[PDB]
Design a protein around this ligand. Structure first.
Ligand SMILES: [Mg+2]
Ligand SMILES: [Zn+2]
Ligand SMILES: [Zn+2]
Lengths: 78, 199, 189, 48, 49, 82, 124, 48, 97
């Protein structure tokens, strides 16, 4: 059974927002509706608050094992 | 000056500037106001897509003269770098395809770093939110002055502007002023009120 | 001639295509990449037979496209020794008769593979054969092709790779045989 | 007809391996020898 | 070492470089095989001694 | 200016061979033996592998071989030829 | 890319023809996207193979035909090569089988040959 | 380069807004749509 | 280049490469130091482990072993620099996964 913390760390927030912003900048599918938005990163933060992002982080332990957690499934906070 | 300590760890950089600083209390504690004559020079290589298309048409109509304007275009279907001094620009607003590149100026609300030279500790470099104003010197709120230890005696400040989304995001989330109020040494708070507020 | 082969590979899908199931997109792309090519050791591929493994879809810093590793299975054209074949005549030369299946064309049949009683022509390009007492000492074939029968007896792979700093052969060829007793003119046999 | 070509392979450095070269290895690496003490033509063109 | 990474120009280990991202992609692993009929051991068990 | 040739000339030239009969016989016996003893099962070439498809020709022109017979009382335990 | 096995399996002409038939089933069932000439290349190769394979005798065979043939001709001392190539030929005379059967007279006899010929001619 | 994106440019000249090096071209009142960064010397230290 | 007299932009000494690590950002550091500044691409041959050019290894006299990498130009300079002193940094290449 998963052992790592159930919260998302600063670094995970940063990288997931970054990569989803890169994706959204291109024509990748989008799920949250947008109020005239124009910047990728704002779309990214909107979705993250909506927990709509299609990503799974695969945390690595030092010995090669790993866990997976759903971004929609971690504990999130401002 | 040798190889390593020269151009391996000390590599120089472009998309940057330098200028004098002066106070401006009437802004928030998370914005730095760049001068207009610098916002025409640092440019962001945006990528046009379904959502943002029409805005960038508005920019490309302008040319390099009006502040919100652009300087170069690069195209998906051919990777040439047209220069907006030339040509009937409005047509090139129509010719855009998703995946093309347009190099826009700085626009109000763009993540931009900021720095003071004699780095001593983590906080000597931060990530503000940009704004444009007609004078010729970097202006920001004075509460942030203790971290930098800057004093408006005639100092110089550098400035950078990243070029890839993931880098932009890391600059905002980690290096934002609002996430770095306490110093990481002992938990003391540094960003606070100053002379003439304390009175 | 048609033979199955087992493959593995890694492939990416640009980030403007996640709107569709990955199995389908990997099918298209993997097809497009192999499409109508020779493999150095096994010859001309036709198409995939089926996929069997779709490893997880990684994403990499600076690239929006996901990256995935695959196990899959493909069909390739490899005739094996002495095997009996049917092919259109592709042409003629003193070095041998030319043969093709329309979709594939790299077959030759030299005079040693030709039937015995005659092994040269009237010096005209078309091969004209002879028999001992019957037959008109002239029977021949035509380039646009009759589907003749032949036995594969030799092959060759040749490296068409480039050499030296950057900036007539074909990689894969076969040899057939028609001289066997009971074999020869298709109008006759 | 065409033989399949690997267009590219995404690659990454694994290790550096420091070591010496022999006189014969040095020959094999070189493109040309240089056997002259002078560098330019004596003419006006200053050609190498 | 991270210093090496600065020398070599590739992302470091610590920080946001420490973990990986997998796409939440519409994917079926080990999808049903395409059958074949020509070959089975029942047909092709060798006849040699 | 112009680097010399790869092979500079030589004033001397190698002494010619001396003729000798029993030595020439030996010369002949050398080229005979080097081709002869390669048959001895101490010599090894690659084992047979990678046949196309079972064709009863392989039954008729089959290759014959039987495992070697070293001295089982002189080498360490694992010496069994298999 | 790597090849785990370049000699994974042989196949009967119907197997590839069956694949070709189901492949032409979806022929241009997608939209008029016209992505690249690779579309044209695969169309050319597949259509030309199908069209030529249409000229082969093994057209219109059936899976149960194949399997029942295999079971029927199991006892005739044949090799995999003989079995598969014969299924790929459907012969009509004893001349060509001697071409196909190595050491024919040392192994078989004309009555077995006739039984095989009748069975293959009728079944396929 | 040489051309503008497609048509009849063949010449190259320098121009630049701000501390840069871009290759003016003169079939389009353009910069060969390319530019290249000049490389130069100094901060160290007629024939023999 | 150097500075304002000759159009040199800015310098980012070691003491800011330290703060970037302090925060722990990685893509920012990578960008700022090799993408934006002086990114360049080079070619190597896996078989011998030496550098080449234009898709060809002059050492091995072969084509099937060369490949192209990204690299900070300063480090390519350094690899061409050591060899003069007969210290040869041979390379072993690997899959990117
Ligand atoms: Mg001061
Ligand atoms: Zn023109
Ligand atoms: Zn090499």
């Amino acid at each position: 059974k998963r052992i790592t913390t159930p919260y998302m760390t600063k670094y995970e927030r940063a990288r997931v927002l970054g990569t989803r912003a890169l994706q959204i900048a291109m024509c990748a599918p989008v799920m949250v509706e947008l109020e005239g938005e124009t910047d990728p990163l704002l779309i990214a933060m909107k979705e993250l608050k909506a927990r709509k992002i299609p990503i799974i982080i695969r945390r690595y332990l030092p010995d090669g094992s790993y866990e997976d957690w759903g971004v929609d499934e971690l504990i999130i906070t401002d | 000056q040798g190889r390593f300590r020269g151009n391996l760890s000390g590599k120089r950089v472009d998309f940057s500037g330098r200028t004098v600083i002066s106070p401006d209390p009437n802004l928030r504690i998370d914005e730095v106001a760049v001068p207009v004559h610098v916002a025409k020079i640092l440019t962001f290589p945006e990528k046009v897509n379904k959502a943002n298309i029409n805005f960038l048409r508005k920019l490309v109509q302008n040319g390099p003269e009006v502040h919100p304007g652009a300087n170069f275009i690069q195209q998906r279907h051919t990777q040439m770098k047209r220069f907006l001094k030339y040509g009937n620009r409005e047509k090139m607003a129509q010719e855009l395809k998703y995946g093309d590149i347009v190099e826009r100026h700085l626009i109000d609300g763009d993540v931009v770093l900021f720095n003071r030279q004699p780095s001593l500790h983590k906080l000597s470099i931060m990530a503000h939110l940009a704004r444009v104003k007609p004078h010729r010197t970097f202006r920001f709120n004075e509460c942030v002055c203790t971290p930098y230890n800057a004093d408006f005696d005639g100092d110089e400040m550098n400035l950078h502007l990243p070029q890839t989304e993931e880098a932009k995001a890391e600059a905002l989330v980690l290096m934002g002023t609002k996430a770095n109020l306490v110093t990481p040494r002992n938990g003391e708070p540094l960003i606070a009120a100053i002379q003439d507020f304390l009175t | 001639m048609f033979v199955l082969v087992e493959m593995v590979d890694t492939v990416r899908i640009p980030p403007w295509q996640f709107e569709r199931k990955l199995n389908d997109s990997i099918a298209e792309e993997l097809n497009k990449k192999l499409a109508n090519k020779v493999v150095y050791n096994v010859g001309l591929c036709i198409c995939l037979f089926d996929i069997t493994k779709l490893e997880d879809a990684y994403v990499f810093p600076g690239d929006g496209a996901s990256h995935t590793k695959v196990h899959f299975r493909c069909v390739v054209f490899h005739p094996f020794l002495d095997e009996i074949l049917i092919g259109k005549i592709k042409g003629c030369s003193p070095e041998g008769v030319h043969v093709s299946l329309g979709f594939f064309d790299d077959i030759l049949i030299p005079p040693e593979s030709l039937q015995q009683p005659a092994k040269f022509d009237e010096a005209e390009q078309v091969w004209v054969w002879e028999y001992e007492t019957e037959e008109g000492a002239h029977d021949l074939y035509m380039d646009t092709g009759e589907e003749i029968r032949f036995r594969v007896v030799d092959e060759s792979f040749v490296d068409t790779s480039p050499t030296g700093p950057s900036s007539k052969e074909a990689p894969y060829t076969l040899v057939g045989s028609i001289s066997e007793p009971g074999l020869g003119l298709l109008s006759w046999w | 007809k065409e033989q399949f070509r690997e267009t590219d392979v995404a690659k990454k450095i694994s290790h550096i391996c420091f070591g010496m070269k022999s006189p014969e290895e040095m020959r094999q690496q070189a493109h040309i020898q240089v056997v002259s003490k002078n560098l330019y033509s004596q003419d006006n063109q200053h050609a190498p | 070492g991270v210093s090496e990474c600065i020398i070599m120009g590739i992302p470091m280990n610590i920080g946001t470089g420490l973990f990986k991202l997998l796409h939440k992609a519409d994917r079926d692993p080990n999808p049903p095989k395409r059958p074949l009929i020509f070959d089975t051991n029942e047909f092709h068990i060798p006849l040699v001694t | 200016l112009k680097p010399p040739p790869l092979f500079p000339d030589t004033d001397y030239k190698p002494v010619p061979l001396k003729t000798g009969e029993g030595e020439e016989y030996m010369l002949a016996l050398k080229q005979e033996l080097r081709e002869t003893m390669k048959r001895m099962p101490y010599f090894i070439e690659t084992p047979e592998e990678r046949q196309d498809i079972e064709r009863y020709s392989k039954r008729y022109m089959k290759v014959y071989k039987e495992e070697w017979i070293p001295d089982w009382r002189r080498l360490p335990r694992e010496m069994m030829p298999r | 890319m790597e090849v785990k096995d370049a000699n994974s399996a042989l196949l009967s002409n119907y197997e590839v023809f069956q694949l070709l038939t189901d492949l032409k089933e979806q022929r241009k069932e997608s939209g008029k996207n016209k992505h690249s000439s690779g579309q044209q290349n695969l169309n050319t190769i597949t259509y030309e193979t199908l069209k030529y394979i249409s000229k082969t005798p093994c057209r219109h065979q059936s899976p149960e035909i194949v399997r029942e043939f295999l079971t029927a001709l199991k006892s005739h001392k044949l090799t995999k090569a003989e079995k598969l190539q014969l299924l790929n030929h459907r012969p009509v005379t004893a001349v060509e089988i001697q071409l196909m059967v190595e050491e024919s007279e040392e192994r078989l006899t004309e009555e077995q040959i006739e039984a095989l010929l009748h069975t293959v001619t009728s079944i396929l | 380069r040489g051309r503008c994106p497609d048509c009849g440019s063949t010449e190259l000249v320098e121009d630049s807004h701000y501390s840069q090096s871009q290759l003016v071209c003169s079939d389009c009142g353009c910069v060969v749509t390319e530019g290249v960064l000049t490389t130069t010397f100094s901060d160290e230290g007629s024939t023999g | 280049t150097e500075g304002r007299s000759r159009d040199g932009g800015l310098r980012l000494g070691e003491m800011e490469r330290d703060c970037l690590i302090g925060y722990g950002a990685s893509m920012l550091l990578l960008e700022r130091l090799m993408i934006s500044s002086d990114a360049f691409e080079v070619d190597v041959c896996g078989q011998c482990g030496l550098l080449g050019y234009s898709g060809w290894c002059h050492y091995c006299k072969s084509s099937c072993h060369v490949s192209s990498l990204r690299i900070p130009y300063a480090c390519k300079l350094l690899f061409q620099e050591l060899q003069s002193m007969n210290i040869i940094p041979r390379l072993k290449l690997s899959k990117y996964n």
